Design a protein around this ligand. Structure first.
Ligand SMILES: Nc1ncnc2c1ncn2[C@@H]1O[C@H](COP(=O)(O)OP(=O)(O)O)[C@@H](O)[C@H]1O
Ligand SMILES: Nc1ncnc2c1ncn2[C@@H]1O[C@H](COP(=O)(O)OP(=O)(O)O)[C@@H](O)[C@H]1O
Ligand SMILES: CCCCCCCNC(=O)CCNC(=O)[C@H](O)C(C)(C)COP(=O)(O)O
Ligand SMILES: CCCCCCCNC(=O)CCNC(=O)[C@H](O)C(C)(C)COP(=O)(O)O
Ligand SMILES: [Mg+2]
Ligand SMILES: [Mg+2]
Lengths: 273, 273
């Protein structure tokens, strides 16, 4: 039994490897003591750790651990998953939409971080809570899926009206920019939450397409737990990526890229010269 | 009396020129009929118009009008204001933070639009209203200035804790990402509004610095009415621009760039070959 753990800001992702097969597990970072409880019931010779909370797991258990930097671990695990899933890409941007969002350019050989933004899953939860009082992640995301953004967001065509606009009229001109034009609307929790997911998706995708243009790649791979149980977010991102002439990729178990990467990096750290 | 009008999504900006001197006026786009009332009391031979609502003014009054595209009008008026204010820049990004945000690269000769995002003034107002029930712009912005974002936003150092992080620990990791860690906090209107201004500023600045890097300029000029009565927004943007090694510029009357640009373009449209 080997174990890779990516202990992030909101979720701890665990990949248990037992004889040619992955078992995937998640736990809330809030419940990190329960991950330690679990580890203490296993027969594990070594922990392969990454993520901001890796140090906390390592401090709190007597199993040898090695820590890897999340950006390299994520890149490496993602490279493995892409190849397993039949994608042999020469280069790509990857956008890791976790608690927050980190953007990387992979040139075929290694990753470099090319930007980031605090619009991600943490915003969906936190701003979602302020607008709906919902704390349960499944409830929040389920509620959002069929929300109508029309009374909340302003489009370019709302500003330009009968004049042909200088950029496409369907584009969002201002997230939440229609609220003051609809002050007698019922701003339902569903509608508000859809608009939160909308702005997060639009910001992420805009940054990803911008760095794809800068680094001359048409491929953009989207990973992170923020996509889980959020088909709306996936659609916002996929649609706008395609509109801007890039190819979006989503990866089965992509949220476990870092954990897979930690196991791989540990394995290949052992060499000599 | 010559008149330039930039009739935007939220504000109509008017520049009245009378014998070597500008007079600046603003009106809400909501009140566009009151701009037409005003125009009908003046002695104006021609209107120089730009912005999404230009067509509405032109349709509703019997004074000859010529319409200019806002991106060129803004660029040209901004170039005039920069030189008047002692800035002789070889190149720059300009970020027009209006109802929404439009980003341009000026290479010394002309502008091209290099991106945009729906995070801008309209979001400040609309999301601000959803979080505070305040509709008055001065009240909203004044309330926000001294808000404390600490119980609302998550920083990198909150995730990494005792481990040295791979990027600076003071950076926002997740806008609104601390809300679920402070569910018993008093989320005051001031604090919520500061966090709205924060995310808008951070997104704008992140996009501006990214395109500054792409187009190889260190100069970033920020214009738009979204900065009016919002010293907090100005500070968020200035600080993060400087952190990322770029030089921020704010322009006196920069929000009137388009209106000034329309008057100039009209003037120089008359030539022959
Ligand atoms: N079961 C869940 N509980 C809470 N958040 C979830 C869950 N599933 C998905 N998420 C979403 O995923 C985000 C975290 O993404 P992830 O890639 O795991 O980030 P991190 O590495 O920072 O923990 C959350 O902020 C939330 O939007
Ligand atoms: N008196 C005001 N009333 C309403 N909004 C204001 C006012 N002053 C500044 N603003 C801010 O400026 C934004 C509009 O910026 P501006 O550059 O004029 O945009 P546009 O060209 O789309 O009208 C508003 O969304 C708001 O955040
Ligand atoms: C004060 C100026 C604000 C500028 C901050 C905006 C930029 N912020 C960032 O680039 C960090 C965005 N967040 C991230 O990259 C990730 O959330 C990270 C901090 C790496 C932690 O990883 P995850 O737990 O996997 O999200
Ligand atoms: C559906 C996919 C969403 C992608 C939309 C995100 C990108 N949106 C944009 O680039 C438009 C941002 N807004 C602007 O550039 C301006 O608000 C504009 C529409 C030009 C109108 O000018 P202003 O009234 O001066 O703000
Ligand atoms: Mg992570
Ligand atoms: Mg404008």
């Amino acid at each position: 039994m080997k174990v890779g753990i990516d202990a992030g800001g909101t979720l701890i992702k665990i990949v248990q490897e037992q004889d040619n097969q992955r078992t995937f597990k998640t736990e809330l970072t809030k419940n990190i003591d329960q991950v330690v409880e679990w580890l203490n019931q296993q027969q594990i010779e070594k922990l392969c750790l990454t993520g901001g909370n890796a140090g906390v797991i390592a401090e709190n258990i007597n199993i040898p651990a090695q820590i890897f930097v999340e950006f390299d671990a994520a890149s490496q695990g993602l490279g493995i998953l892409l190849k397993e899933q039949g994608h042999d890409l020469a280069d790509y941007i990857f956008a890791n939409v976790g608690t927050g969002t980190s953007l990387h350019y992979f040139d075929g050989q290694s990753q470099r971080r090319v930007g980031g933004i605090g619009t991600g899953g943490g915003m969906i939860q936190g701003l979602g809570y302020l607008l709906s009082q919902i704390t349960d992640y499944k409830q929040l995301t389920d509620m959002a899926q069929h929300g109508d953004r029309n009374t909340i967001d302003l489009k370019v065509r709302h500003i330009y009206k009968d004049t042909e606009p200088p950029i496409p009229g369907d584009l969002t001109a201002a997230n939440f920019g229609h609220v003051l034009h609809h002050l007698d609307a019922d701003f339902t929790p569903s509608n508000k939450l859809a608009a939160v997911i909308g702005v997060v998706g639009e910001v992420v995708t805009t940054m990803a397409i911008t760095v794809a243009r800068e680094f001359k790649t048409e491929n953009i791979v989207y990973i992170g737990s923020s996509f889980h149980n959020n088909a709306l977010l996936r659609k916002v991102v996929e649609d706008y990526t395609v509109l801007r002439g890039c190819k979006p990729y989503y990866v089965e178990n992509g949220a476990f890229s870092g954990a897979i990467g930690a196991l791989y990096l540990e394995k290949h750290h052992h060499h000599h010269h």
